[PDB]
Design a protein around this ligand. Sequence first.
Ligand SMILES: *C(=O)[C@@H]([C@@H]1CC(SCCNC=N)=C(C(=O)O)N1)[C@@H](C)O
Length: 169
Amino acid sequence: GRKLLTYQVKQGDTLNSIAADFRISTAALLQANPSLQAGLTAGQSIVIPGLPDPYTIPYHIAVSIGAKTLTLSLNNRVMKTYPIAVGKILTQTPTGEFYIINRQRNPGGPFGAYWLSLSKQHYGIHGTNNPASIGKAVSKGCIRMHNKDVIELASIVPNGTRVTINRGS
Ligand SMILES: *C(=O)[C@@H]([C@@H]1CC(SCCNC=N)=C(C(=O)O)N1)[C@@H](C)O
């Protein structure tokens, strides 16, 4: 069958934060990972029960802050590239990986057609009513694009898509 997801926590992470960071209960992430009853540890690896494994999944989101574009990739080759908010002077390479964990039903409002979640706190892939700041403005690091674009990606990238955000060089 298809495997459940793995996560590797970064220095400073905490149980509750990570659980509902994964849109789940700490107890469920505990059930699968009794190491975490007590807590989480930098570089430690944890399973996300009820969520499939990103290695069964072939999808690879390469959004380099340096590249200022988020590249979709299947089977070692890109699917398509979407523009995102990087900034005009924002350094510090976040050496970590996130996963496309969720997609939300048509909200009905300016939430941007779809709400897709990343795996670390204040990061998400979503939509907009204003795409003109996308890739061309300092929108405080918002990973949003056109409605249909974020639904394209949405339906292709599954509940465990690998996504990295790095300034590169
Ligand atoms: C980016 O497009 C916005 C930015 C988004 C957010 S956080 C929104 C909710 N995310 C999910 N919990 C902003 C914020 O300050 O909270 N603003 C930018 C253009 O203002």
